[PDB]
Design a protein around this nucleic acid. Sequence first.
RNA 1: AAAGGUUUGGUCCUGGCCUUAUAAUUAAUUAGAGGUAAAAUUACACAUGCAAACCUCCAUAGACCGGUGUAAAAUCCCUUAAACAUU
Lengths: 54, 74, 53, 170, 126, 197, 294
Amino acid sequence: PYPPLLRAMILAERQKNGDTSVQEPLLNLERTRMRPWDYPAKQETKGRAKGTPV
Amino acid sequence: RKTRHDPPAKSKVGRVQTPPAVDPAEFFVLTERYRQYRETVRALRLEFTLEVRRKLHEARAGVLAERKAQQAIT
Amino acid sequence: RKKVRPRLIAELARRVRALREQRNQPRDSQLYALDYETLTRPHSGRRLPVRAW
Amino acid sequence: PMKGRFPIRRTLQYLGRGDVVFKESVKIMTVNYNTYGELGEGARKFVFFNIPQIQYKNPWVQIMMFKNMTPSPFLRFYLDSGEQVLVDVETKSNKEIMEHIKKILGKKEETLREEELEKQQRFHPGNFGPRKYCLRECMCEVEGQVPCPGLVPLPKEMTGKYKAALKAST
Amino acid sequence: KAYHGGHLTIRLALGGCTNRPFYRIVAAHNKCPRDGRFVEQLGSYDPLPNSHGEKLVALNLDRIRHWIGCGAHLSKPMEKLLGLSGFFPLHPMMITNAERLRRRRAREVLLASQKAESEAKETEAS
Amino acid sequence: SSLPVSPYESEPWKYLDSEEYHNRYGSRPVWADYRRNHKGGVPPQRTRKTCIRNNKVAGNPCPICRDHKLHVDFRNVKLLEQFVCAHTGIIFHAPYTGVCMKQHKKLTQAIQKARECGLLSYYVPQVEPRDADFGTVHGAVSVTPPAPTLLSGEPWYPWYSWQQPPERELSRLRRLYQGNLLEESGPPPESMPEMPT
Amino acid sequence: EVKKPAFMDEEVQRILTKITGLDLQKTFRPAIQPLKPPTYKLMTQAQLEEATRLAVEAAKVRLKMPPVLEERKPINDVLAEDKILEGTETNKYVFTDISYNIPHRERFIVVREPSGTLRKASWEERDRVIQIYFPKEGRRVLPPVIFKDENLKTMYSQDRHADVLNLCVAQFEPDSAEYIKVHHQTYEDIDRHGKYELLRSTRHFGGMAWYFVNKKKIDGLLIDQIQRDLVDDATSLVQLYHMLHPDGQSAQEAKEQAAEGVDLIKVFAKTEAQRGAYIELALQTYQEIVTSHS
RNA sequence: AAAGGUUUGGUCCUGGCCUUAUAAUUAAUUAGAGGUAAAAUUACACAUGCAAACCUCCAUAGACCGGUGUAAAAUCCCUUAAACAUU
Ligand code: FES
Ligand SMILES: [K+]
Ligand SMILES: [K+]
Ligand SMILES: [Mg+2]
Ligand SMILES: [Mg+2]
Ligand SMILES: [Mg+2]
Ligand SMILES: [Mg+2]
Ligand SMILES: [Zn+2]
């Protein structure tokens, strides 16, 4: 579902524009699915430490 | 705030990390809430990203945009 | 304007510094060396986090 | 007494009375007029009275005027496309000249109003900040909201000094 | 200042006086000072209850959607504000903290009953 | 330490209709025959802070302070009108009438209170209604169809509620954080426990 | 079904404008405000008449009547009931959408209560917060104190009814209960004391006559219009009463007798007038004076 | 500026100085408490303490915040282009 306020703003716009429907607004999560936090990252784009000793 | 060229304090050389203790039941429930919350927020950020680009295209090359350009030339 | 003048020393310094970095690049055996008694890297003195000990 | 003839021409109100706002195409307006003659009186009056008003509303347009170079006065506009619009202003009153150029190369009232509204899009009355940009600096100014401590002292229980004392007492 | 690196963020800028806090919701580069240069003001938050007992939040939901669509991050207090409004889902830690408070008051209620029972034993002793 | 006591304290408006007022002031304002003593031709931009300090009176008491029977009350409209411009309806600044800053603030508050209660008239501009359209059929001011979760009584999102972790996952965390653990927590109370009092 | 006439009906606006009247001296009475030195123009009789015409055009826009609407219905809609947040907050949050280009009656203003319920802001809450973020000149965030019955009665004693109504239009919304309360209190005070002249040549006369017609108490306004020699207005008022009450005994009697002009007022007296005896007496006296003198 | 004082034996003109208003710093004399705002001789030299960490190792950050007015007529506004140590 959409968040409570954002759902009401969608349904309100439907009625204003003349769209008559009782369909429930739904968010699609397929396009934006997150990898696990421990998924291997890109080593090529990672930094390397400098060569000045402390 | 210090710069990278500043010398470190002598009262904190002994400092070592104290990681927080973990409650197994609450840690897992919280980890799942973050994953589900962040997925919902990514879907909404994408919906907002599309409205920005839709509105931009309508202004740049919408019906009204094209008519006014030719109307002026005529 | 026209009173802004070149800064040769800055130009020389930038190039010279960059050259030295390429010549004296460290190796993985040095950057990632470890002293297992203290669990601290000698190259930088970085002490590993506790959860990794 | 303000110097010169018709010193009203050197007032901001007069300069703002101009109504000819050129389209973005207009880049240059050359004015060719004669200082002596009878059929060029309107052209001479147009340079005297109207050219300041046109420049004031069109600061980026180059107005260059040439005197006694041709038998008759005319106006030539140079547009960004490369087109050249010649206007003949002989036997034409200064008011007539202004109306002619307004029609052919002047922005309409509708276009100018839209630009004004778009300019003010980012000003919001609800926004808080300095007087230069906003109506109210702080929410304390709003009626019913907690007033500024400087004008009106806060209750003791709402003060960090008091809260710290209780924590020590605990 | 001439910043190099960083991102746009939506955060709360603190205003007001001592013991009288007031916040401006703004979109700003993350490296800018808290109360300094911003890009747009997106609303305001008054955290002190008013005469009617209402904490007043103003959200420019059209411009907020615009800046989230352009990559603007959100600070954690602003993520909490959007959750209370209903524009965003409730933040994970808003729910967790509410659970912790429920578990902490349950202990207090139980202890008070135990103390009352201990006091009842004192009543039995007379 | 004995300031005189006015007989008109209860009903201040009475004084301005009495014969004593007419003889002293006639039909002119009470500040008409007052002049400020100051060096130079341009006077200071503020009047003296107050004419009365601890029952003592200053050298040249202001129009309000010099006459004790005059009372600055929102109900004494006839006195208040003398301190407001009849043509523009603007309250005069203190240097104009020569009243002290204390009485000027008191007069300003009495004038503002009198106007708010309608005792003292002022010009009300004619303003148009706020909204061009007066419809109340938009969802914001109307009824939104109730969401499915709201009708059933469920949380808006399933993860709002506490969902017991699987036992295998609780063991996986006890191994990962072995040696730095807290006591396992069960389901939280269904409602907020009533605050003990 | 024959539609009930509305306040904005072109026929109703015509009749209400006529009975209201116009007076360039009353409509443009000098404002007590910061003044500037007057300007002067030399004008011929044609130019002066043109300027008077523009003054009458402006007096028409100045006399535009304010809306007459029915009382709004309380907003009682719950968007959500998140009970997880019960007891975690002590004060209500009020969230206002302050996007510039939204009509004020189409903005979303919600309230998160301490119990966790997310509900829509009530009408009183909507008006307060819209003043705080879109402040309107003339309006105050909190309801002023002049509208209290004791304070309003003071304004009525000073014959400041047009002011009570001009303030009620600056502060309250036309559909609010407070707006309707003050207007109906002012209109009732004018009736009892026969002070109908106070609102003539003002934008508030139409609503007053509208209120009397709907409440079937035009008797006082007719008696006063006749005594002021405004008998064309009195006839138009009886036409408006026969338009909003078509099935009334008076409206059916005028159709039977095809009454017009002064006849319409006589029909009303016999049929539906609360005080018919007086309407005839004043109407008769007017006829005697007109006939006797001219 | 709504002006004023001051050249002469006297009048008029010209013309400068000064007075009256407003504000900041310092000083003399004097002074209860409370709320708020501000804090400032010096790019001269500095004892001492603190001001940058985080984290299952890699990385990321310490390029910010904070400070001063050093240098320079140094700038403003506007155009084009390309990038970012970014999102
Ligand atoms: S200026 Fe608003 S609280 Fe002080
Ligand atoms: K002089
Ligand atoms: K001399
Ligand atoms: Mg990692
Ligand atoms: Mg000092
Ligand atoms: Mg800074
Ligand atoms: Mg210098
Ligand atoms: Zn005084």
